[PDB]
Motif scaffolding. Structure first.
Motif, PDB file in Angstrom:
ATOM      1  N   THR C  78       0.961  48.626   8.901  1.00 29.23           N
ATOM      2  CA  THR C  78       0.256  47.972   9.914  1.00 29.23           C
ATOM      3  C   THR C  78      -0.662  47.186   9.147  1.00 29.23           C
ATOM      4  O   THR C  78      -1.521  46.241   9.639  1.00 29.23           O
ATOM      5  CB  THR C  78      -0.662  49.066  10.638  1.00 29.23           C
ATOM      6  OG1 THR C  78      -1.241  49.782   9.913  1.00 29.23           O
ATOM      7  CG2 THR C  78       0.356  49.828  11.303  1.00 29.23           C
ATOM      8  N   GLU C  79      -0.455  47.088   7.774  1.00 35.94           N
ATOM      9  CA  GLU C  79      -1.546  46.352   6.956  1.00 35.94           C
ATOM     10  C   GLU C  79      -3.002  46.625   6.990  1.00 35.94           C
ATOM     11  O   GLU C  79      -3.830  45.791   6.584  1.00 35.94           O
ATOM     12  CB  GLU C  79      -1.394  44.866   7.260  1.00 35.94           C
ATOM     13  CG  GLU C  79      -0.159  44.128   6.671  1.00 35.94           C
ATOM     14  CD  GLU C  79       0.824  43.991   7.801  1.00 35.94           C
ATOM     15  OE1 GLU C  79       2.181  44.084   7.833  1.00 35.94           O
ATOM     16  OE2 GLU C  79       0.525  43.522   9.108  1.00 35.94           O
ATOM     17  N   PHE C  80      -3.320  48.007   7.396  1.00 33.80           N
ATOM     18  CA  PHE C  80      -4.512  48.754   6.948  1.00 33.80           C
ATOM     19  C   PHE C  80      -4.421  49.645   5.755  1.00 33.80           C
ATOM     20  O   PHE C  80      -3.250  49.822   5.043  1.00 33.80           O
ATOM     21  CB  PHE C  80      -4.724  49.447   8.370  1.00 33.80           C
ATOM     22  CG  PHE C  80      -5.565  48.537   9.392  1.00 33.80           C
ATOM     23  CD1 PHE C  80      -4.657  47.611  10.202  1.00 33.80           C
ATOM     24  CD2 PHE C  80      -6.693  48.679   9.330  1.00 33.80           C
ATOM     25  CE1 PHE C  80      -5.330  46.920  11.120  1.00 33.80           C
ATOM     26  CE2 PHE C  80      -7.337  47.575  10.382  1.00 33.80           C
ATOM     27  CZ  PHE C  80      -6.743  46.879  11.376  1.00 33.80           C
ATOM     28  N   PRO C  81      -5.502  49.961   4.937  1.00 32.62           N
ATOM     29  CA  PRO C  81      -5.363  50.649   3.904  1.00 32.62           C
ATOM     30  C   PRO C  81      -4.358  51.770   3.465  1.00 32.62           C
ATOM     31  O   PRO C  81      -4.196  52.096   2.427  1.00 32.62           O
ATOM     32  CB  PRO C  81      -6.654  50.932   3.499  1.00 32.62           C
ATOM     33  CG  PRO C  81      -7.493  49.686   4.119  1.00 32.62           C
ATOM     34  CD  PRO C  81      -6.729  49.396   5.468  1.00 32.62           C
TER      35      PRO C  81
END
Ligand SMILES: [Mg+2]
Ligand SMILES: [Mg+2]
Ligand SMILES: [Mg+2]
Ligand SMILES: [Mg+2]
Ligand SMILES: [Mg+2]
Ligand SMILES: [Mg+2]
Ligand SMILES: [Mg+2]
Ligand SMILES: [Mg+2]
Ligand SMILES: [Mg+2]
Ligand SMILES: [Mg+2]
Ligand SMILES: [Mg+2]
Ligand SMILES: [Mg+2]
Ligand SMILES: [Mg+2]
Ligand SMILES: [Zn+2]
Lengths: 38, 211, 142, 175
Positions: C78-81
């Motif tokens: 999701t392109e979150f950490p």
RNA sequence: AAACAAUCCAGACCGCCAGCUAAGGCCCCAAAAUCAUAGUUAAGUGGGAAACGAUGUGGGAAGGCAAGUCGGCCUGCGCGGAAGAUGUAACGGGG
RNA sequence: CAUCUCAUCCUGGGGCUGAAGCAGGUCCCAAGGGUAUGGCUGUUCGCCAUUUAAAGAGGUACGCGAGCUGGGUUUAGAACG
RNA sequence: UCUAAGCGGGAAGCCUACCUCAAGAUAAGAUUUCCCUAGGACUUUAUGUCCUCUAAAGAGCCGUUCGAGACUAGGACGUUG
């Protein structure tokens, strides 16, 4: 249960089993012999 | 869950016979009028569309005028839908009216409103960031952010990082509030505690989702 | 004389329906991609979409060999950490069979505007029925 | 492969049909079924079932040897059922079947009850004893294990729920 | 050889929308076998790693005892031993 | 102001026990959340006092000075051995 | 003999479940309602051009402002208030 790399019979009531690609030792005389190769 | 649309009128207290004061919020309900019923056959889902209030006819467009005249109801100030089931869609028809008697004293509800807007705010207010030294040699860094990352691994700021920006003005739901009084002649609900928003803003009351 | 390119205005795409009941996934995907690109036509031109339309029906009856139904993993970020997300083949096939063909076939095509335009001509449906009865598809026995 | 290559004695009343890869039995106690693996043949005489491998490989003998052993139980049960008996040991533990649902009191803060499935039945001679009786041997063993798993027997005083023909390890706790 | 001065094949005078081969390859990305014949593997092994453990499975030369059974060696391919930090991430990928 | 790993400190699920009970030891599964305030010293650490369910171990330029500080170290003054 | 065929139980973990956002989801989804129905020439002969006629539903500019706000955007009202 003892999780070991070298599992083997200990007494005359130890049976070597193969469940799901895991080699195990089950003993009907005393449950402190249960072994799982891992 | 079918509910009511009302207006937050203010905040009060109610003393009980045992002397305990109960902080309460008053919600005014002009009785809601059913403008449309959405069903599985023509929409894909079951819902009751509702209007409340009043609008002058010079601010109602010709499309909304036709939509309101297709039912019997008069034009209100807003339109809102409630997702329902049957055994909840039982006797509801266009040109019907839902009043405060949908609720009872001692019921638990959720109230959703639009909270107050605080504007562009910093880290100390938006995210409870701690401030730095006030006077021990500190130069110009009191309510500033501090560090925002690492060093060339990963070489970027991560997504969802907590920074300064706009605060408030969102949709907020408060669960678990109790009905204290259902006044039928003034058409008012009184609930216990605080509800989101300013006085005069549109709120929605519906039975609690936890139960 | 010289070698001529196919004109996009003269290209004629056709319509075919292929049934996926009891079929290995990749051995079907290679055929689908070869038809989508137009390699079976003597007017094949690598910069022109001279391919054909394909309709897949019964997309939830496609098969895998070995132990892959439980052991093949599909990933997403999701392109979150920490947003790596994981699923199975068998959870994804009973819940979204369109994405299995999407991934399997799109991995076997070029990666650019013409590859994005070729994957549009594949239409995948879980059941036995499709809506494109007006286009008159042929039964392609792949 | 001694278990296969041998026939089972089918008495009268028992009935076997093979419409498909299914084999169902019909006697007096009830009606059962058994799906068969795709490498086994069946050829009854009139009361003599014959389970053979197809293509006669290492796996097919192993599959037939159990295809035989389970329908031998099916036909062994539909006529003459199966019986299991559990005992409760320890003061206060007591079980009494409320109609079709078994009520056990096993040293807890709440009363335990078990809702049986359709097959097995269960009766109650005394307090400290239960008897289950059924035609399906697998389901009967399952019900016995499920009731035993509530207060499984312990090794210091032997209390709990036990099978009658069950050997219990025992210890003493001196120092 | 994914990318990769020093590895493998090969030493570029210029032009051609002609042909044969080298190393390496022939299911799709991506040119050429979803080619033919006989086997092994079930571990995605192939596609990372030891001492040691084990009725996995295929082949071979012998023994003891009386429907065969017992356990012993030599071997092909596999199993466990096997934990790391931004994101799958130890086949380039799809498969 | 963070972000990740698991070789897991607490909490969750288990096997064995020289496991009566309560409480322990050991091994397995488990990374969702959580995981002290002070005295001393520049300290990281460490010792001590009083708490807590617990006061984990590590990677990230021994994370982070174009975000702050500047006590130590390591310019120019001065002194002791 | 818990596994080879077949049938089960099982964790603060996983997927749902609760709150918020979300069709630029370029596959750009759905439902209710509202608006627009004139003439001539003309040739690069086709969603072709040119000249008179027309200007809807609606949106915006502007004004009075706000419990909305950096500028925006968003909400209400503008004499029948
Ligand atoms: Mg404001
Ligand atoms: Mg300064
Ligand atoms: Mg200052
Ligand atoms: Mg980078
Ligand atoms: Mg190259
Ligand atoms: Mg090719
Ligand atoms: Mg072939
Ligand atoms: Mg671990
Ligand atoms: Mg300290
Ligand atoms: Mg002091
Ligand atoms: Mg540093
Ligand atoms: Mg200094
Ligand atoms: Mg000096
Ligand atoms: Zn033993």
């Amino acid at each position: 249960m003892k999780v070991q790399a070298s599992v083997k019979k200990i007494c005359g009531s130890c049976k070597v089993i193969r469940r799901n690609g895991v080699i195990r030792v089950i003993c009907s005389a005393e449950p402190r012999h249960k072994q799982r190769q891992g | 869950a079918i509910g009511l649309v009302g207006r937050k009128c203010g905040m009060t207290r109610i003393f009980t016979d045992a002397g305990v004061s109960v902080p309460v919020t008053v919600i005014e309900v002009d009785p809601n009028r059913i403008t449309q019923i959405k069903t599985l056959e023509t929409d894909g889902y079951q819902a009751v569309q509702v209007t409340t209030g009043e609008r002058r006819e010079s601010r109602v467009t010709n499309a909304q005028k036709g939509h309101f005249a297709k039912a019997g109801v008069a034009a209100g100030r807003l339109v809102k839908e409630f997702r329902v089931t049957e055994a909840e869609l039982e006797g509801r028809e266009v040109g019907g009216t839902i009043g405060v008697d949908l609720f009872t004293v001692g019921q638990i509800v959720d109230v959703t409103g639009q909270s107050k807007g605080k504007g562009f705010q910093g880290g100390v207010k938006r995210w409870n960031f701690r401030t730095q030294d006030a006077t021990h040699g500190n130069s110009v860094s009191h309510r500033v952010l501090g560090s925002t990352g690492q060093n060339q691994t990963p070489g970027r700021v991560f997504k969802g990082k907590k920074m300064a920006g706009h605060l408030g003005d969102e949709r907020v739901t408060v669960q678990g509030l109790e009905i204290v009084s259902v006044d039928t002649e003034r058409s008012v609900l009184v609930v216990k505690g605080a509800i989101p928003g300013a006085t005069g803003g549109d709120v929605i009351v519906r039975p609690t989702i936890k139960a | 004389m010289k070698t001529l390119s196919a004109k996009p205005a003269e290209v004629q795409h056709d319509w075919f329906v292929v049934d996926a009941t009891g079929k290995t996934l990749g051995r079907l995907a290679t055929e689908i991609a070869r038809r989508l690109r137009g390699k079976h036509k003597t007017s094949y031109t690598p910069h022109v979409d001279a391919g054909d339309y394909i309709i897949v029906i019964n997309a939830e009856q496609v098969q895998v060999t070995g132990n892959k139904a439980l052991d093949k993993k599909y990933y997403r970020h999701t392109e979150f950490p920490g947003g790596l997300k994981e699923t199975n083949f068998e959870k994804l096939v009973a819940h979204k069979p369109e994405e299995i063909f999407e991934r399997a076939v799109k991995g076997m095509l070029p990666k650019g505007p013409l590859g994005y335009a070729m994957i549009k001509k594949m239409k995948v449906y879980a059941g036995s029925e499709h809506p494109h009865a007006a286009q008159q598809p042929q039964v392609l026995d792949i | 492969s001694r278990v296969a290559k041998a026939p089972v004695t089918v008495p009268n009343g028992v009935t076997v049909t093979q419409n498909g890869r299914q084999v169902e039995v019909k006697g007096s106690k009830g009606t059962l079924s058994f799906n068969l693996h795709a490498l086994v043949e069946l050829k009854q005489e009139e009361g003599k079932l014959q389970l053979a491998p197809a293509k006669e490989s290492k796996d097919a003998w192993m599959q037939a040897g159990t295809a035989r052993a389970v329908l031998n139980n099916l036909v062994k049960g539909v006529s003459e059922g199966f019986e299991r008996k559990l005992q409760l040991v320890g003061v206060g533990y007591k079980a009494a079947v409320k109609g079709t649902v078994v009520n056990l009191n096993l040293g807890y803060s709440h009363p335990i009850d078990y809702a049986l499935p359709e097959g097995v039945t269960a009766e109650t001679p005394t307090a400290t004893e239960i008897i289950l009786k059924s035609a399906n041997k697998q389901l009967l063993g399952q019900v016995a294990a499920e009731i035993r798993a509530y207060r499984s027997p312990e090794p210091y005083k032997g209390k709990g729920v036990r099978y009658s023909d069950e050997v219990i390890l025992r210890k003493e706790a001196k120092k």
